Amino acid sequence: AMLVIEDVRAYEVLDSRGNPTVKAEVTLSDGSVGAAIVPSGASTGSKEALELRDNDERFGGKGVLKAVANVNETIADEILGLDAFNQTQLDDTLRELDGTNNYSNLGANATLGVSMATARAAAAALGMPLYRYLGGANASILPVPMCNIINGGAHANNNVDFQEFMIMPFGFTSFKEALRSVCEIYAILKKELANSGHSTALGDEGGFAPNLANNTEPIDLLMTCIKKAGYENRVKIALDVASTEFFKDGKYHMEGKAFSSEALIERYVELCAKYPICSIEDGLAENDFEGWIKLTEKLGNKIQLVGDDLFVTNEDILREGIIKKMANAVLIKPNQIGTITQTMRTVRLAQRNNYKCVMSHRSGESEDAFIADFAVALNTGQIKTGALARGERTAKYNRLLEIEFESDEYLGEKL
Amino acid sequence: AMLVIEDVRAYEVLDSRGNPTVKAEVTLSDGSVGAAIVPSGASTGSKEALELRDNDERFGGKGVLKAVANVNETIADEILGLDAFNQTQLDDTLRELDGTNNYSNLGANATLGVSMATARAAAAALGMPLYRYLGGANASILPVPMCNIINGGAHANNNVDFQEFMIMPFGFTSFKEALRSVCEIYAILKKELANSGHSTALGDEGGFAPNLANNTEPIDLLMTCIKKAGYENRVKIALDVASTEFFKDGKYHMEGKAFSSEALIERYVELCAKYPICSIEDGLAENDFEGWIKLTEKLGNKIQLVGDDLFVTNEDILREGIIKKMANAVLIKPNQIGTITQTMRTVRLAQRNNYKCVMSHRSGESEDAFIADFAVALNTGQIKTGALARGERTAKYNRLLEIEFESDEYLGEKL
Amino acid sequence: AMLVIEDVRAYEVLDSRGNPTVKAEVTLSDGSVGAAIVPSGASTGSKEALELRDNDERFGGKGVLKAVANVNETIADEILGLDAFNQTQLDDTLRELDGTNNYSNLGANATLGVSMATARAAAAALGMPLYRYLGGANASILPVPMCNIINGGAHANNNVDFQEFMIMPFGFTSFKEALRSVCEIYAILKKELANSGHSTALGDEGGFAPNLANNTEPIDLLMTCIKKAGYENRVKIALDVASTEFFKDGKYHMEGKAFSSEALIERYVELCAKYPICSIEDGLAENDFEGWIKLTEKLGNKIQLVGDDLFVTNEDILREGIIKKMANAVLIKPNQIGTITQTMRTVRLAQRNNYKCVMSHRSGESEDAFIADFAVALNTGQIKTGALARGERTAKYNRLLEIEFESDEYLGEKL
Amino acid sequence: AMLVIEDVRAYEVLDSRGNPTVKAEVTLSDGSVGAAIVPSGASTGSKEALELRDNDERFGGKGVLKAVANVNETIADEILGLDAFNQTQLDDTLRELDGTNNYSNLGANATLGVSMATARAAAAALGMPLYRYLGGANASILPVPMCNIINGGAHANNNVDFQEFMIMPFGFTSFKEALRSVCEIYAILKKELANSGHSTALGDEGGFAPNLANNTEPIDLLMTCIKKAGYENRVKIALDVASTEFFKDGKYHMEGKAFSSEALIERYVELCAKYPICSIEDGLAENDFEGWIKLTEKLGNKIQLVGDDLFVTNEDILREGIIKKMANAVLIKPNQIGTITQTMRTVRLAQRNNYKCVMSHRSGESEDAFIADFAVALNTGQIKTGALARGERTAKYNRLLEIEFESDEYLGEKL
Ligand SMILES: [Mg+2]
Ligand SMILES: [Mg+2]
Ligand SMILES: [Mg+2]
Ligand SMILES: [Mg+2]
16 A cells, blocks of 8 residues: 555534534545545434434534544544555445444444545645546536525525525536626625615525515526626526425425425426526425426426435435436435445446436535535536535635636536 | 745635635745635725725626736746745735835735735645744634624614624633534524524624614623523623714714714713623724723723724724724734734734734635634734634634644633 | 656557557656557548558558657657646647647647556556546446457458457456456357367457358357356347448448348347347448437437447537437547547547447557556446457456456446 | 565466466565566476466366465565565575476466566666666667468468468668568568468467468468568578477378478478578477487588477576587577576576577467567577567567667677
């Protein structure tokens, strides 16, 4: 082995909502250090990989001291002396040590931080950028971002049922010019809101949560801001419906109605005919398997249909989805699965079977921009990393602006 | 010269509000690299160091391509080959190259970034943390934070005159426990706001801007939340009144009145008698010199009186203030003055003359945590770096949690 | 730049058929050296990147002294001092230096060798295997080989119209066992041929060219050998028809008849219904656009349809093929396009649009196993590199056996 | 010891006929790596050093898993920590560890791999070409190749008795021009066979096996091709009769007859009177001692007489040959004897006693070109490494073309 893991440590830091999370730091035998901050995920649930939370008097039960302990003691003891450069061996060792199928022992907050930290340490020792370490010279594509600038659903307290209303800048030949257009549109939206007596205060991802009437008003507002900014036809709309949040008893409860699966599908067809929606995430619920099958038949050749809660970044669940023809794209949330290698597996599966991958943030983020490198490393072509404000979101865009001096490839509207 | 500056560059990145700002990167002759991002400043005004803005069609007038060109061409040409370790010579060269008394040639956004980036590159060459590079083995004190968790004034659209309502965790023997307290109190406040029908969406610094009635309602709310959290007597209140914003025709226009300077002082005496306010910033206007003299006589021995707009991190203006006995503390905003050395000169003058220094963020921040290390390097004992949310604020608290593993001295209530 | 290209040279070597070709060697500023040998291409044609041949009295007009001089003089002069690790800038520089759309100035045999040699040199400098240099930690899949063990058409002198009859070992969980199976099937074929009085002497790719009656006898013989070897149901059949070779006057002349495009497609339907054929390459001619659209409608959901002459590894021609729905896979011959970057672009375009990539050899190969690393770097999942004999074929299989000790993932029949 | 052997391993790869062989890899304590592939030999026999073969269900009984194990376990355990640069000590240790006179224990395929691999690793550590490591600055002579371009005997299934019909380019002042002459002659031979209805498919060493009528018809064809190519009198003919293959009950069964030793000798005399045959290998059988003595007396001062099966590269057998005046040259096959030092011992014996050495390939070769370096290292002046086709042959020619840029000395016709 060329270099080995010499030291590993973790400690408690704060995420962008002010809750604790794990930072890990790995030192190699040449003295190269890498570190990484894990975004916040879910500590209960039977599908997702689980993060460990302390549930004691500190920080409202949200301390991560046990996750931190598991890195400093259990993981440390198992990985010191492993080859720094064999990411797959490190990640498989983490899985085997945990011994469950959802990291319910070590905690995904313990395993991901160590997984990302080791990769960074390896890249540092080679003097190479992280995206080159993860994806080689083939790492090239700067992703088209989808930028959540108007919020509703559970992400707000309004009458808007849909969770995320996003703008996507396709009509550009460079990432920086694309980034500039969404920045300009966001500024215009802020003004439009202020001038009609709405709050300009921000939600967790940097977007606005004004109390609008329904699910089409926010779209109309995006359209008029896009046009006023001078980008008509070059910026399109993406939605995250998060339909599991309002699915009860076989029905979807929105817009004062109780919708059937088939009726909600017809609603999306309607919306897609009237507005330049290019993508819809979680249009149907995470267990509405029959509905998704229909959704994909009706719209899967016209628009992107992204599984988030449907697939939870999980290779096996995505495989069954691929087989049964559900969706045509998958949100990629690395902490949801627990190591960089398992994330890569899910992405490779999707890309071998015509599913697009959207590298994704979490609601509780950090200053760590790992997912900007990851999106380029795997040529995802898409990233979902927030509005154009709040440092835990702008850190990712800034990283992508850096990577752009070395590899400036942006697909925009090109195949 | 041991190592020399070998390369200097800059490029446009985004600050935490979605406006462009400068990131600079300096490479030394051993290959060590340092980078820094500059927070947003003022591009107009007659007192402060000015940042350069392009004022063209991009980003609503706020592009920084001229500043960036100033790093890439003008500064680079001048500093290539200078001793990496002579910060003072670097910063003095920048001042001379600029040739003005307010950086209105190079732009303070061009000079600060290079000043910061060179310091990080020198610390990296030595394998030393930034705070050790800046302040040596004498760097020791983890500062007490003042955290802006309720906003008013120009920072919101309410009936509240004062700008910032802050909590300061004095009653603790460690920084980690001090920070926990403010995080717990912030979470409690978030919940109180939500249950009382206020928005929990955030202002620029991560605080809330509810439409409250007056200037004491916000204080009462902080007090309730402090006690509910279990930290009664251990956490005090600081204010930024930003009184220049309501000073007109010799009078202060607040609480539906027109106060003379004398009347406003006795109002502060009242407030300080009723509540545990330990610090008031810009209690009087930036040009109300007579008022400041009287205020300082009246409360200067009981509470901290911070000059922000009064001093603008400027050594000369501070010197006159000391001589005239105005204030007993100074807010330190490095980008206001334009280099690290000029910042250190202002701090040293203050500390030689019994004025406390509060190391400060700006409204437009980034993921760069320089001011955390800077606060420790200079033993300021206090920092003002935002609420306990938004990554551009939590990055500083996190950096302070890392520094604490090497130097854990927290003064708290100790002399 | 960490390391820069310090030296570039070339010289004439011999390919696996005894003709000259270009060997290039690149030295970096730390002393690291990479070398590569270019497979032989086409010095005429209207679509392909051209290789320069001397056309003098040496080597029957096939000298490459002008290609060699282009590396030693023109390319060298231009790329000395360029950043070793920026493959894309290297390859874009080679393209621009050339100035044409098909390397008809420098020659693709001049540019590919330097392109590959720089990549090997950068990988050696980092102590990294080439596949990790090219595809990072994400480089993982060992490809399923398609092995050309019976020949016909222009690659023989017989009644067989089709050019290549190949076996593909799908039914295995490891590459080594898959490879053993095809070696075992190959040895059995050899014995069967010898016992029937056929020659066991080899064509250019290591396969046999017995004088068989038609296009189905070779397939019947492959099935018999698959079964005797013990691998029934685990090894499938792939074909390269190379139909352009018998396309004349809008018809295909084979099996003693003149087929319409439509009639030839129906022959493939019949063949596929009777035999386990998983892939057909150049089933229709390189210019039979309407036929390919029909073929792809008819069989593209059931079998792999590989464009070789159709696409000539060219991203622009492939892109039109995607838009026009022709084929669902593409043969990747790096020397056909001229740089490793242009190769990666064609592969990325393919993989974004649901086309499979088959990393391929040429008839004139060398001991250079670059395409083995390249297949793994880009997770192509498939490779065509010859029969299981002749060192210029076995060098690639051996390289894949070496890569297998570091990443052993073999998909086989898995999605 | 400047460096020591730090790691030793082996694994199965494929030879050029598609059978397993051993690849060995040796790493030194500076991290320098050397690797080597063993050509195929004999698992049985009472004269040659033996290669170990598995004899189980894998690869028709040709697996080398036991050889591989002997490298990874027995050898490794014995040589780890030995001086990297003491080639003689390493090779003697291998011989001692084996404890037989014919490597029947470890297997010659286990020991030669390690022997070559260590030499390459030492050369790499010194930054020197292998031929310099083995032969120093005195290593100079590029060998005259004998190129087997028409096959008979056991190497085909024709009515041709002799095994190899070779061309040798003496009439040139550079190796490259000699190599070009043989490439051009081979191309002309290919055309001649294709126009007279013969197969152009290749045998194991890259030559053709047309069904000719006797042993002079092939020579006639070589002469025609030499003259048509324009190289008359500059290229000569060398034969390998491999007469042991047809020797039985005292006599030599060829051309429908049983020849006495003396009659076969008179046949060589006739053949050498009529054609420019400069060398004959194994003209008489391996145990026909009285015959060899007469053949040597008769033609030994006129033509080269090479022992292959007569001497099996074995020092002791050659020594007795020298004493009894049998042959005037020895074929040198390193895997036949089992280490580089032992190979060297045999060559030095020969060169001290006026025996010419022909560095030789095996019919199961690999991409490894060790024997090209070895020929130059020892100034053999002659090499037999196949036809001008197939990668496992052209790899050697190419390596000699590389060495020619550093040492261009070619004797050709000079003493
Ligand atoms: Mg979602
Ligand atoms: Mg202030
Ligand atoms: Mg083809
Ligand atoms: Mg022989």
